[PDB]
Nucleic acid binder design. Structure first.
Lengths: 418, 399
DNA sequence: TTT
């Protein structure tokens, strides 16, 4: 049902309209409004404004949000801090979404933040702290997503992310008996069970799924379940999970699309085919560049975040991109966000290069999972099409430098997420 | 400046050798940053110039390569003669023996940070507490003056006790001056007249036996409170000098020193990978190598922690075994990690009685941006942490 | 998720 394209069209058109309104409201020039650091501050503000936790009770007004906005003053970039009532941001978001809930658009910006974090930060320390292997880095899609992300969030979380969450719950349960006991212990028990079914949904073999059934129905979850969850994570390195992959773009790309009269509602939109590639092909996004950062390396980071491509084979990504997509360890860039202590007056901006050449579309079960792992074969470039091939009629034959590393995480030196 | 010039030329030569061996073995730049590869290359040039002390004309060991997204072990074999040639050609015809001994001291510092010697100590009639006095205890027999300079009191005492015991032998004129020089080297390391006098007495017994061992044990015990003066040399794996020279760094012109900011600058911009065994903590492997690089096994952990800016923990609490992978180990199962090698800061019977009286009476850190050492940072230590790397020790015994 |  083309109704799905209709609904997704309306979500991203809402984000666009919101972004245009926030730019007029903050008196951003159209140049400043194409700065990805501005997009991320505005996206963080609408997300905080709708984060109903609050704890109205040190010196930080809980009714207020904001952050850094970067403006051209006298031929250089300057940091100006802003402060906004959450209430007015909510009003601007509802007014752009014509009074609807528009929670889908919020979760969409969240999945964009999660995909950018996956492309930017290392989680090997979080893995070691949990008794997981560093090799499980390739299984950590969505590992920085909040609780509040619902079904779209859960859909993109990798096996490692789910296993890390279940191990963190088991350990609190080991730590205190009265974690599992009475009224509130009843609560965390179904949260535990749901988390098991979400991870069960991701496994594609009956053996792996059965093992999760066993993990879900232990009355005293402890080390034996952690050990079984570690075994399952290791198996997911060869008998791979089914993980949803959603290309979500910064609000400033949807904003520039709606300002140019693009009608997302009528054309529809999809996070899965040509649609994000078409928008990125005609995009004009600027980024602040630190001194001695390579802007082509910053471009790779953002292209990768936008196409949710951190966990994809680099040779496949290279082919679709039409320029080499290199391991993170070889990038001369740090992340998009500028820290508070950084000097932005020393920083130039570059147009990000976001185009592509192509677009694209317990012991029994242990034994059986080992047999399958040994039997497994040791391309992924299938549904690649020309941008002129709107209907996917002419699959392009993949062309790889097969001697390049497949994993984005080979030789990784990225900052640890914190 | 001519000291810096000569040290610059040694380190630049090691770099040039490493770059040549990487082209020779068709190592990619990624493979060449693997510390296991560096150790195989360093072991090969050291064996090729004789034990440091199967077909004896040939040397080799494991080289690890990326094939189909995994690490694979390839055993290699080279005529010693061609390795010697490649070393000399990298050191511009000279027989750069300083550079050989430099790689040796790096191996010795790594062993000191990795392996227990408490069994070797007990076998010699020494105390396990003397673990903290065993710098250089794995150094090859005669490593010349740089070797002898970094050997701790315990190491010298263990060597002298081993000689006395063989004599319980005195060709006999030979071993007598070897004995005498070993006594003067150990005398050099003691910082009190009483301790030094006692060594003079030990050097001039015509029949060295149990009484000299007993005096050597007494002196080792005293070195736990009236500490010796020991050289500490920060020597890095060849792959770090190699990566520095490939980036056009000119060690000869800039000079180099093993003592101030120079090794810290190199480590701060380094990219060294290590094979990690399953269930090993990569941050623990990083501590091991950071410690080996800064010759810091015998330093107070609270000093090490301060300079490092992250806690440097006792060996007994580390979840790693050593850097070298044994022959029977499965490398295809192993990932590699970037070693974390950065720092927050950089840094610069009468006699018996009198040694007892003294024993009873006993009670430069700079920013890496502070190139000239102008602004000493006042240290702040967690005094409730243990000071000794060897507290709670469980490391494998050296063999 | 306002320095």
């Amino acid at each position: 049902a083309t109704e799905i394209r209709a609904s997704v069209g309306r979500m991203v058109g809402g984000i666009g309209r919101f972004y245009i309104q926030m730019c007029t409201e903050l008196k951003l020039s159209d140049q400043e409004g194409r700065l990805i650091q501005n997009s991320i501050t505005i996206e963080r503000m609408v997300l905080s404004a709708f984060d109903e936790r609050r704890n109205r009770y040190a010196g930080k007004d809980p009714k207020k949000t904001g952050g850094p906005i970067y403006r051209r003053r006298d031929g250089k970039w300057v940091r100006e801090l802003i402060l906004y009532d959450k209430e007015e941001i909510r009003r601007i978001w509802r007014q752009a979404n014509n009074g609807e809930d528009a929670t889908a658009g919020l979760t969409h910006m969240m999945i964009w933040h999660s995909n950018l974090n996956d492309a930017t930060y290392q989680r090997t320390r979080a893995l070691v702290r949990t008794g997981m292997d560093p090799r499980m880095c390739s299984l950590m899609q969505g590992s920085t997503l909040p609780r509040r992300s619902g079904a779209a969030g859960a859909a993109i979380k990798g096996v490692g992310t789910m296993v890390m969450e279940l191990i963190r719950m088991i350990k609190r349960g080991i730590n205190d008996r009265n974690f599992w006991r009475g009224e509130n212990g009843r609560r965390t028990r179904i949260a535990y069970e749901r988390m098991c079914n979400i991870l069960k949904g991701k496994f594609q073999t009956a053996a792996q799924k059965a093992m999760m059934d066993q993990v879900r129905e232990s009355r005293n979850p402890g080390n034996a379940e952690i050990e079984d969850l570690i075994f399952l994570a290791r198996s997911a390195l060869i008998l791979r999970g089914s993980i949803a992959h959603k290309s979500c773009l910064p609000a400033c790309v949807y904003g520039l699309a709606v300002a140019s009269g693009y009608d997302f509602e009528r054309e529809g939109y999809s996070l899965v085919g040509i649609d994000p590639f078409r928008l990125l092909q005609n995009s004009q996004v600027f980024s602040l560049i630190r001194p001695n950062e390579n802007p082509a390396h910053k471009s790779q980071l953002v292209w990768m975040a936008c196409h949710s491509a951190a966990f994809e084979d680099l040779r496949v990504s290279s082919f679709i991109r039409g320029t080499r997509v290199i391991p993170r360890g070889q990038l001369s860039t740090r992340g998009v966000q500028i820290a508070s202590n950084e000097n932005v007056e020393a920083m130039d901006s570059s147009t990000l290069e976001l185009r592509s050449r192509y677009w694209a579309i317990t012991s029994d079960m242990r034994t059986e999972i080992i047999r399958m792992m040994e039997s497994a074969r040791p391309f992924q470039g299938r549904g690649v099409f020309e941008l002129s091939d709107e209907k996917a009629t002419n699959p392009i034959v993949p062309s790889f430098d097969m001697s390049n590393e497949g994993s984005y995480f080979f030789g990784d030196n990225a900052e640890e997420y914190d």
